[PDB]
Design a protein around this ligand. Structure first.
Ligand SMILES: CCCCCCCC/C=C\CCCCCCCCOC(=O)[C@H](O)CO
Ligand SMILES: CCCCCCCC/C=C\CCCCCCCCOC(=O)[C@H](O)CO
Ligand SMILES: *C/C=C(C)/C=C/C=C(C)/C=C/C1=C(C)CCCC1(C)C
Length: 227
């Protein structure tokens, strides 16, 4: 544990609200249907995240887990429900942009669900070796996620014009750079090796989420590529 983390839950919440509020204000002049499909998907992401963050702020979706070890971890489980719904949407979004087939997006969200699910079990087990084991398999599968991202979506976008290739790189980079830190944050946070407390791990996830979501969706929506 180590409380006071709710300040990150509050600022996280409102950043989502603001990002979501902005995308609406910006998607007001929108015209082509496909562009509109992008706006629903993008605005859907911090929406869900904000509801998730609001529940955590009000203390819902918290849960204590006494480890075999003896230690007890306060674990925010709403977080993993958040990720369950939100990550297949960022994948869909970048996927649509890349012009990847639903077969390919679907295969990528298939391994995303496994990653977030096994991450959830690692967070919740009492047996501490199994925490680290399910952590290992989760990040293994995140590496295949990242591989098929750069290669399957990458190959789909190679036929596309310069600006949807440059937009897709900008988004591919964000995912690579920011999704890769999530499992290290789990590791050094209280859920893993506990180098930081609950307060600093929370801070970390909050920052990562805002750029995975508002930063990401900002770049997508604001782009000559989608009109
Ligand atoms: C495992 C994969 C399942 C697939 C479903 C994914 C969607 C479910 C989303 C969130 C699950 C909620 C976590 C439940 C743990 C809370 C009690 C934790 O209890 C603990 C306390 O010490 C009891 O007093
Ligand atoms: C703990 C803090 C974590 C924060 C993580 C860092 C946030 C920013 C992460 C990655 C930067 C994104 C790279 C943009 C690539 C654009 C070059 C290519 O784009 C395009 C060109 O026009 C190609 O001609
Ligand atoms: C907006 C939320 C996002 C982009 C969440 C991304 C989540 C991950 C990249 C999760 C990674 C994890 C592992 C690779 C295993 C260790 C535990 C997890 C769930 C943190």
């Amino acid at each position: 544990g180590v409380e006071g983390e709710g300040i990150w839950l509050a600022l996280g919440t409102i950043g989502m609200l603001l990002g979501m509020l902005y995308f609406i204000a910006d998607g007001l002049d929108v015209q082509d249907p496909r562009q509109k499909e992008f706006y629903v998907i993008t605005i859907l992401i911090p929406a869900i995240a904000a509801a998730s963050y609001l529940s955590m702020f009000f203390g819902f979706g918290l849960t204590e887990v006494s480890l075999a070890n003896g230690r007890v971890v306060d674990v925010y489980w709403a977080r993993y429900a958040n990720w369950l719904f939100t990550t297949p949407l960022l994948l869909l979004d970048i996927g649509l942009l890349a012009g990847a087939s639903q077969r390919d997006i679907g295969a990528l969200v298939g391994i995303d669900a496994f990653m977030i699910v096994t991450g959830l079990v690692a967070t919740l087990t009492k047996v501490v070796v199994a925490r680290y084991a399910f952590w290992t398999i989760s990040t293994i599968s995140m590496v295949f996620l990242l591989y098929y991202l750069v290669a399957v979506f990458g190959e789909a976008v190679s036929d596309a014009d310069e600006d949807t290739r440059s937009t897709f790189n900008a988004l591919r980079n964000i995912i690579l750079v920011t999704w890769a830190i999530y499992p290290v944050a789990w590791l050094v946070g209280t859920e893993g090796l506990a180098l930081t407390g609950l307060y600093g791990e929370t801070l970390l996830f909050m920052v990562l989420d805002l750029v995975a979501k508002v930063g990401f969706g900002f770049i997508l929506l604001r782009s000559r590529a989608i009109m």
